[PDB]
Amino acid sequence: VLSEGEWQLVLHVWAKVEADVAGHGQDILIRLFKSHPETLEKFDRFKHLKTEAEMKASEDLKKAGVTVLTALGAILKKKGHHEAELKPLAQSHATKHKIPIKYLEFISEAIIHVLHSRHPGNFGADAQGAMNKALELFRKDIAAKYKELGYQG
């Protein structure tokens, strides 16, 4: 369970993300697909992308990044009261997309890496700890839903 102070560290960095969600999404997805290339195999619309330059040039990838970060942002703004938002996401990621918890860990890593790089003003140690706790909560709750849905994750 996060504190309000922890939530405020999360939401204060998120506010900067929201200056340019699309740009942050490109950096985060490039980081994920570079660090864990296997994750790209899950995407029929993206698995062909060969290089960072191709990724940066993909209007579809840019749109996807906006989608992902906006969904995550809506979850974070619930400050842990995100049962409603997690239902459809868990169901789709468990049943249609088949996304293991390990891969959710990988994108969490990618998010933290990019925020640390772009936002040293709002992403010191305490803020990073807060964001790691928020993302751990997200993954813990998703994994519990996966189990309910019949997916081991």
Domain with 3, as residue range(s), is 1-153
CATH number for position 69: 1.10.490.10
- What is the spatial distance between Cα 78 and Cα 142, in angstroms, rounded to a whole number? 15
- Technique of determination: X-ray
Contact 30, 52 (CB under 8 A): yes
In the chain, the number of structural domains is 1
Alpha helices in the chain (DSSP H): 4-17, 21-35, 52-57, 59-77, 83-91, 101-118, 125-149
Distance CA(52)–CA(25), nearest Å, equals: 13
Beta-carbon contacts of 150 under 8 Å, excluding residues fewer than 6 positions away, are: 94
- Distant-in-sequence contacts of 19-26, Cβ < 8 A, 24+ apart: 21/65, 21/66, 21/69, 21/70, 21/73, 22/62, 22/63, 22/65, 22/66, 24/65, 24/69, 24/114, 24/118, 25/62, 25/64, 25/65, 25/66, 25/68, 25/69, 26/55, 26/56, 26/61, 26/62, 26/65
